[PDB]
Paper text:
As an attempt to stabilize NatA at the distal site, we added MAP2 to the NatA-80S complex and recorded a cryo-EM dataset. Indeed, concurrent binding of human MAP2 constrained the conformational freedom of NatA and improved the local resolution up to ~4 Å, without interfering with the NatA distal position. In the ternary NatA-MAP2-80S complex, neither MAP2 nor NatA binding is altered in the presence of the other factor, and there is no direct interaction between their structured domains. The first contact is formed by a long α-helix detached from the Naa15 scaffold (helix α34, residues 591–628), which wedges in the widened major groove of a protruding kink-loop of expansion segment ES7L(A) (proximal and extended: nucleotides 467-471 and 683-688) and also bridges a large gap of over 55 Å to ES44L. The second contact to the PTE is formed by the N-terminal TPR motif (helices α1 and α2) positioned in between exposed ribosomal 28S rRNA helices (H19 and H24) and the peripheral lining of uL24. While Naa15 contributes most prominently to the ribosome interactions, Naa10 also contacts uL24 in some of the NatA states that we captured (interface less than 100 Å2 calculated using PISA39). The structure of the ternary NatA-MAP2-80S complex now shows ES27L locked away in the ES27Lin position at the 60S/40S interface (as also observed in our binary NatA-80S complex).
Residue numbers in the entry:
A (entry chain 2): 2 to 170
B (entry chain B): 7 to 840
C (entry chain LY): 1 to 129
D (entry chain LC): 162 to 267
Write the structure that this text describes.
Amino acid sequence: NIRNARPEDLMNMQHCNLLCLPENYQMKYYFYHGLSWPQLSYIAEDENGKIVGYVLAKMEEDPDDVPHGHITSLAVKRSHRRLGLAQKLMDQASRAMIENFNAKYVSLHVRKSNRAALHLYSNTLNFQISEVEPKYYADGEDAYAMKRDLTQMADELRRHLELKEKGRH
Amino acid sequence: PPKENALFKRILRCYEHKQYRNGLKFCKQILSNPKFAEHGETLAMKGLTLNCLGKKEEAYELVRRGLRNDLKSHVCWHVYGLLQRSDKKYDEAIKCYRNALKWDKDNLQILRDLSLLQIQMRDLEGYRETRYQLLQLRPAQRASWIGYAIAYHLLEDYEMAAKILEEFRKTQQTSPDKVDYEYSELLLYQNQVLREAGLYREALEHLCTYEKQICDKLAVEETKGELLLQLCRLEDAADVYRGLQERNPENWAYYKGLEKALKPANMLERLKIYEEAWTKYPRGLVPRRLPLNFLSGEKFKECLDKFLRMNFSKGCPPVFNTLRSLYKDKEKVAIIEELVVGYETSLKSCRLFNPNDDGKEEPPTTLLWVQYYLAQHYDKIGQPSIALEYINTAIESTPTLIELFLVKAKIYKHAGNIKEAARWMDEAQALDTADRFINSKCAKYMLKANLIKEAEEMCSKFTREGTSAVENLNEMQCMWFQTECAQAYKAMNKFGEALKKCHEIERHFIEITDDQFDFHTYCMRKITLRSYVDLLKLEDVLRQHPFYFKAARIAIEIYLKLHDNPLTDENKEHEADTANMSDKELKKLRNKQRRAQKKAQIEEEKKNAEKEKQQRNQKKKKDDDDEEIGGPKEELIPEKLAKVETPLEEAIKFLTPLKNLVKNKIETHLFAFEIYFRKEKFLLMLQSVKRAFAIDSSHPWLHECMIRLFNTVCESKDLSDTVRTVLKQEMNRLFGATNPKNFNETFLKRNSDSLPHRLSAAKMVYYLDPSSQKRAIELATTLDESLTNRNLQTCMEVLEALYDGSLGDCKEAAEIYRANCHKLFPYALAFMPP
Amino acid sequence: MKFNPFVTSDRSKNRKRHFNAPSHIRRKIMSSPLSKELRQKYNVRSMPIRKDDEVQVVRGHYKGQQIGKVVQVYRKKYVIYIERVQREKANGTTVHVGIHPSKVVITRLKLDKDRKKILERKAKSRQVG
Amino acid sequence: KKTKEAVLLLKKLKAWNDIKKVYASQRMRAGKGKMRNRRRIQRRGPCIIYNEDNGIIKAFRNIPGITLLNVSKLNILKLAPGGHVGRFCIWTESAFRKLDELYGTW
RNA sequence: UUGAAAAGAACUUUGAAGAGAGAGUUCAAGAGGGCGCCGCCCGGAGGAUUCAACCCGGCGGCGGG
RNA sequence: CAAGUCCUUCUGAUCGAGGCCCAGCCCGUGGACGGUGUGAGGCCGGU
RNA sequence: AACGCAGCUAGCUGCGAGAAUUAAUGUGAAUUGCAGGACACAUUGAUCAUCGACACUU
Ligand SMILES: O=P(O)(O)O[C@H]1[C@@H](OP(=O)(O)O)[C@@H](OP(=O)(O)O)[C@@H](OP(=O)(O)O)[C@@H](OP(=O)(O)O)[C@@H]1OP(=O)(O)O
């Protein structure tokens, strides 16, 4: 499942991120993300109502910077991996991202050893390495600045909007 | 005077920009003049400066002196108000702010801070009046209108809140911007208020006017779908929901909307609804799982066959998880079991799902996944041997798959072997140590296996350097690990550490609710008012999470044990030890004890000195303490926390959020019953019994409650007759008015098929009649296959109930029951023969 | 220790060139450090000051958290002027206070054609190392 | 090749305490020497006496107080800094064995 | 060679002014424009890791053809 | 074309005084010098 | 060596009727005591430095 994060659930990726990713934080920018961009955070829920996946994204606040998004965190449990849950989360988050902000691209940061997410981002989501920033994390291991252009899928999103508006009339 | 006034302005300037020391230095020369030595406002500002420097008592004294020097000075009262708010003493802060307003009625800062407070402690009337005054004072500010609308919204009075919204939006119709995200948020909030009022027609008409002014198309479409469902425009709702389906095929809400819009008369049409969904979009696992929730018979057979075929060809992990819901009905269990067995046999014979299939030969990984499914199925059904042999075969075939392990964990933990599972997934974490999912779940198992030190050590592989794993995890408010640590500490009877963990949970919950204070000034600037109000309704229901429930129940069982039998013997053995001890030799041993205790005191003083300084160097280098001033929480002192003066009272504070929020669960009322029973609260006994009766009148522990209450009321004679009349009416209604023995007997025959019910009935047979212990012994130890919910979990709970003395001394009967359960459950360690 | 025979370490010589320096040279000593956020993003430590940059004072009586913009780069007196760095003259007017560029932090740069080229030239020298 | 390993080295030989003493003894010269380029004065530290130059000078030359001396060319001005004998010296294995050939035995 | 920075003394008052008196700036005008009874013993009333001698371990000094 | 304007504290301002998991803040093939409201390897030019 | 050249300019300094500088190149937002003048800074330019073109009164 993929749906918007109603801050009833902002506590659930707080549960999940500690369980999965070492890049962990408190809950404060969790409210900051949820309140600033309630429509950008999406989650995955099982038949038992427990969170099994999530995406944490945020708008850049630099005015000089071109409109582009950044994902703060994105992970999937081993029980539900290789289902494309991260992929579909990224697609829907980027769709809402373009509809509400018209971003040109999206940036992120990726662990060097997390080779599975590297496969996902490169082969599956066609993301590309922008820059390498060493010692970004607390353990000192290097990270890739990962980016994918969002103009191309925004094009067919506009096409679908035009095809639906012609149908409505 | 003008010069001192200018210096005063520099002082506060320094304060607002956090130059505390410059402010105190500047006020020093102000207080140098004897004519201003007693000057109230400067002393108040100085004290309010030192409060941010940590000296709370000096700040208190100086601020009260400044206040009493000039009560008319609203500045001093405002200073005291920030002083109280600085240490979360909000209730005094409101009073100080109102006292300040009596001198300066039109101070914007005081009124806005008071409004932030009034929303902090939910003073809807006071916040509404404050926002009305602000709106009168500053109508040009959009914050005034926003807050005034907020105040009425929290009142659920959506009519005048709505007209405030439309007026304010007209003020936002000044057209200084394009389709603004904040403007879209305001429109969506106004639509939310309209739809919460039930004014669906005008809400839909208004939203139908501002689609071009809303960037959030998802909210527009979902609101259109629900409103058209409410307005009986079924076709329009169907079109909107199918647009949402093309937008997000993975959300059950859109399938629900399609079902309600189309209104399928029968199951065939309902299936045809998803047929188009998965023909237009075969990829994914959504349109095909939903039919299996309602399909039955041969159609369910073929759809399930297709589902298992595509899942096994894909070979994805969570296939078992999604069909776990279909185990409720045993016909689906038999269908899936025969299907997977046939698949395994066909793959073994000719490497196909069906030998008649025209497709290409399936890979052996498909057979491996089928064996994995079989192992999980037999684990859930209750056949540990078959699941174990299947998982052994799968592991032998593919030893590199980490998922085959966790199935073995499930098998062992459901069979009663937690240590073997913990060791095996220590191996599994050794297979993949980079993933913290396996690390965290591993720590969870040896927390369940009481290897708390081992769990702490291996979590340190990912904890931030410079701190212990326990301190770090307490710092991130690690909820599940803390709760499991508390349960483990309970396992070795360490009540102090478990209560420390539970109070850590309580402190964290207090920490969440004060976080909204900073956000009081954020979203109003961001006009994300929907997120505002829904976040606000979050904290008022914040403690409804099951994590709080498990922490509170751990704490409350600890307190119940420490009140019903509050370990009354604390130091009596030491007194009795010296009774036969000669005075001279008593002096000998007490002198040696004095030597040892004073040497150990010197020892802990010197050793803690280097570690406190080392951790000081750590924390200052962490920059968390290198810039940190406030009120430090007092040490929990787990040893002292164990010897809690008022155990029931602490547990009562714990259920207070349960008693305000978590009323759905019967355990809240049962816990209140237990506490107030140890508080001889019969008047609370009856009401707790009533609340628990309204939820699950057939609960075993609740039947224990009714029985115990009836017996205690019968034996007690100190109750007043006026109370007695109403109470007698209450049992004459709720109870059968018969003797407790016959009531328990009637319950036991009514629930003779459920093992916990029989155990409780036997316990109260023993309690109501200790001479009747033997019949209860036989009643509790039955293990007939006709007994419902007689699983191994009930087996060990019955075993420890027999051991705890709830049925008296039954060591031979407990041993016989243990041996019989071991025959039933060979892998259960709690039934391992002596 | 300096090993270049053609570069002097003499006190009087070094002072003379610093006090008697052409304006285009003086711009180079008119350098200020970027904040951590620019430094991480541009991979540049220090930049020459310009007429319109968001500048924060970190030393002196006017040290604080507020952000201001340069309004004048007085290269003759080796000082710059921000808006709120003012003091009260006797008669009643308000005059700017000269702050040395080395005692401030650039919080936002005057992003410009020549400027944009300047950062990437310095930044691309970092990946060389 | 790097100063970090050089600092770590003599930290293992427990000679780092002298470097801190040199660091502590860093002050302004008194008199007209400030006007004449002799502005800073400090105590002289241990001598490192080597045989072959494979980067030894570049690793150590940045550490205050350290003096590098070639075993083939000794300097009395650096072995007795103020004319007083007894400066702390650290030898390399190759340089140490060359003393018999350089100055002979009895 | 004022002062970190002119922040180079607003304004009030006497004098025709030069000159003052208040006031103000500055950390500084004392920088105002050629200005830098204690050791042992006796007695009493008290308290306490306690004494010697033994046992274990460690470390030194001296001696061994 | 490297690295502290980190924290606490002295001052009118400080480059001053303490501290900086790992035997030891960070760089050091860079601890020359000068400037910057004392006295600065790590603020700046440089080296 | 003399005499002239600055918006306000006596000396010092620089310059030569193109007279506190022209052109060109590098650099890249100032000069400054005041005012004015500037300043898309590439549909290319203040200041400074360099200096190979031009000019250089008796
Ligand atoms: O049905 P059960 O046999 O009682 O197992 C469940 C399951 O345990 P696992 O974590 O081992 O799978 C839950 O986890 P999920 O299946 O949802 O992942 C877990 O809750 P968590 O999700 O928080 O782990 C829950 O725990 P509890 O009974 O305390 O509610 C409980 O496992 P346990 O009975 O072993 O605790």
